[PDB]
Amino acid sequence: MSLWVDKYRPCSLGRLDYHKEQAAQLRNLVQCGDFPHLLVYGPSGAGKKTRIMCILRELYGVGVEKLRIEHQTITTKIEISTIASNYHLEVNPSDAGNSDRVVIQEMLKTVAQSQQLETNSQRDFKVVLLTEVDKLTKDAQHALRRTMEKYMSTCRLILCCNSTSKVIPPIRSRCLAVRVPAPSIEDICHVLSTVCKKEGLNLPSQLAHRLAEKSCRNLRKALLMCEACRVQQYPFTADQEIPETDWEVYLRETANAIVSQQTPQRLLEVRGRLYELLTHCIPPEIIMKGLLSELLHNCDGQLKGEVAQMAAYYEHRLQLGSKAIYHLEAFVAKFMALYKKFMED
C-alpha cells in the first residue's frame, strides 16, 4: 500500500478516472446475465489489469482482492506458479514454454471441476484469467478456444494482451473484444494531480505535461517517474530534472554513437551495446523501436522514410529468424551505410 501505482489503483469500475463510458458499459454487461468471455487488449500501462480487477470486483464480492499463491504441475512434468482467489484463477501460460497448450487444458479442467464444488454464491462460473495471450502458440490458442467451447457453462475466460495481431481469429470470433486505449495527456495529468493532491502535495501543470509526454502515455511509467522526482526533490519546479530508466538512456547513447561515426569499429562497439541491451532481457522489438525513434531525431527529413522502411523490414526478418543480434546488426550496418552515403554527399 506504499507505492502510488498500487495505493491509488481504484477498486471498482465506478471510481475510474478515464474511459468512464467503457466502465459504464462493462457495469451494464456484468449487471445483466449471461456473462461472456472477454478479450481485453490495449497498450501496456493503460489500465487493462485495473479494468479487469474492477470487473471482478463488480462480478464477485470484495473477496476477489484476497489473492493467494498457487502452485500446480502438469504432465508431459512441468511445475508452474499461479495466482488465484476464491472465485478466480490467474495464470500466464506462456511462461511454460511450448508446453503452454497442455497447462492451459489442465488448468481449465481443474477450474471447471472445482467450480461445481459449491462455488456458486454469486455466479454460476469461475473466471480463468490469462495474461499476455499474444505470446501463446497457435496450437495453444486452438486448444484454448476448443476448451473455451467445451466448458463455457461452468467457467468464463478473460484474456489480456498488448495486441491482437498474434491472436488467432477463431479466439477473437468467440470472445468479446474490450479495447482499452492509452489515456490522453490530459487524463494522465489529472490522475497525476489527483494522486499528487490526495497524497497532500502540489504538482504544477507544466511538470505534469512533461511527465505525461515523457511517459509516452504509459500511466505506470508516469506514476513511477512522479514518485521518483518527488523523493528526489519535493519542491517541484518547471525545470525539474525528471529521471528515466537506464536502458532508455543506454539505447539513446547507442543511437548517438551510431550517428557519430560510421565505421566498422564503431559498428562492433554498437554490437557490444546491443549485447548489453539484450542481456537485460529487453525485447528486440523494443530495442528496434527505440533505436529508430532516436535515429529519426538526427536524420534529415528526406532520409527518414528509407530509415523507417529499413527498420520495419529488418524487424520483420528478426521475427522470422531466431538470432536477434543478426538482424539488429544488419539494420545498424545498413543505417550506417546509408547515413555515410548521404552525409558524405
Partner 1 sequence: VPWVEKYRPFQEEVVAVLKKSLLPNLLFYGPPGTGKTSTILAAARELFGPELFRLRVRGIQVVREKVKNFAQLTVSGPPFKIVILDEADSMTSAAQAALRRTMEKESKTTRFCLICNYVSRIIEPLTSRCSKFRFKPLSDKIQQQRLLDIAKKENVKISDEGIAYLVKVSEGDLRKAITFLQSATRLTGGKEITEKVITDIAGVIPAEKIDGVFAACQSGSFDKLEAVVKDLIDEGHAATQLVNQLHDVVVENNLSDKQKSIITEKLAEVDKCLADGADEHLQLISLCATVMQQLSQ
Partner 2 sequence: NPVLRRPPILEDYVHVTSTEGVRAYLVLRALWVDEFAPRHYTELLSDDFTNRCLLKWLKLPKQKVALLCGPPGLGKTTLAHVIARHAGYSVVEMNASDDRSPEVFRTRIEAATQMESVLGAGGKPNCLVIDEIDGGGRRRRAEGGLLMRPIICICNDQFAPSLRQLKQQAFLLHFPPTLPSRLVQRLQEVSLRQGMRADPGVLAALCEKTDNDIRACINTLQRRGLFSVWQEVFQLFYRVLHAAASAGEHEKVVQGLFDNFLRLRLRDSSLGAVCVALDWLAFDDLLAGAAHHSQSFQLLRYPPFLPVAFHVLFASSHTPRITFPSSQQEAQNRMSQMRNLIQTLVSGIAPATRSRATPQALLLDALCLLLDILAPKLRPVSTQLYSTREKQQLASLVGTMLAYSLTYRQERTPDGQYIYRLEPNVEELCRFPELPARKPLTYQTKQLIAREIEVEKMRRA
Ligand X SMILES: Nc1ncnc2c1ncn2[C@@H]1O[C@H](COP(=O)(O)OP(=O)(O)O)[C@@H](O)[C@H]1O
The residues that touch ligand X, with contacts defined as CB under 6 A, are: 5, 8-10, 16-18, 42, 44-50, 180, 191, 219-220
Which of 1/32 has CB closer to partner 2?
A: 1
Burial of 56 (0-12, 13-18, 19+ CB in 10 A): buried
Task: Give dist(CA 246, CA 241) in Å, integer.
Answer: 15
To partner 2, the closest distance from the beta carbon of 142 in angstroms equals 18
163 interacts with partner 1 by CB under 8 A: yes
Q: Which of 316, 337, 340, 342 binds partner 1 (CB under 8 A)?
A: 316
Tell me how long the chain is.
345
CA distance 339 to 312: 17
Nearest to partner 2 of 67, 238 (CB atom): 67
Per CB under 8 A, the list member of 17, 42, 53, 87 interacting with partner 1 is: 42
Quick one: which of 5, 181, 269, 282 contacts partner 1 (CB under 8 A)? 181
Among 228, 312, 337, 343, contact with partner 1 (rule: CB under 8 A): 312
- How near is the Cβ of 58 to partner 2 at its closest, in Å? 17
Q: Contacting partner 1 (CB under 8 A), which of 2, 76, 165, 279?
A: 165
The DSSP H or E segment spanning 213 is helix 205-215
CB of 344 to partner 2, least distance (A): 9
Q: Which residues contact 85 (CB under 8 A, 6 or more apart)?
A: 63, 64, 65, 66, 67, 68
- Partner interacting with residue 288 (select from partner 2, partner 1, ligand X, none; CB below 5-8 Å by kind): partner 1
Measured distance CA(39)–CA(36) in Å, rounded: 10
What's the CA gap between 332 and 320, in Å, rounded? 18
Question: Counting beta carbons within 10 angstroms of the beta carbon of residue 333, is it exposed (0 to 12), middle (13 to 18) or buried (19 or more)?
Answer: middle
Q: Which is nearer to partner 1, 107 or 188 (CB)?
A: 188
Residues 198-227 that bind partner 1 (CB under 8 A): 217
Who contacts 316 (Cβ-Cβ below 8 Å, separation ≥6)? none
| Beta strands per DSSP E along 132-247 | 155-161, 176-179
* Cβ atoms 49, 160 nearer than 8 A: yes
Is residue 139 at the binding interface for partner 1, with CB under 8 A as the rule? yes
Q: What 3-state DSSP class applies to 160?
A: strand
| Residue 163 interacts with, from partner 2, ligand X, partner 1, none (CB under 5-8 Å by kind) | partner 1
Q: Which does 62 bind (CB under 5 to 8 A by kind): partner 2, ligand X, partner 1, none?
A: none
Q: For residue 94, how many C-alpha atoms fall within 13 Å in the half-sphere facing its CB?
A: 15
49 or 57, CB closer to ligand X? 49
Which lies closer to ligand X via its Cβ, residue 55 or residue 80? 55
Query: 111, exposed or middle or buried, with CB in 10 Å at 0-12, 13-18, 19+?
Result: buried
Residue 3 interacting entry, from ligand X, partner 2, partner 1, none, C-beta within 5 to 8 Å by type: partner 2
Min separation Cβ 318 and partner 2, Å: 9
The entry of ligand X, partner 2, partner 1, none near residue 271 (CB within 5 to 8 angstroms by kind) is partner 2
Q: Are 167 and 138 in contact (CB under 8 A)?
A: no
**57 half-sphere exposure, CB direction, 13 A CA radius:** 17
Contact footprint for partner 1 (CB under 8 A) = 25-26, 28-29, 31-32, 34, 36, 41-43, 46, 139, 142, 146, 163-166, 170, 173, 176-177, 179-182, 217, 285, 288-289, 292, 296, 301, 304-305, 308-309, 311-313, 315-316, 319-320
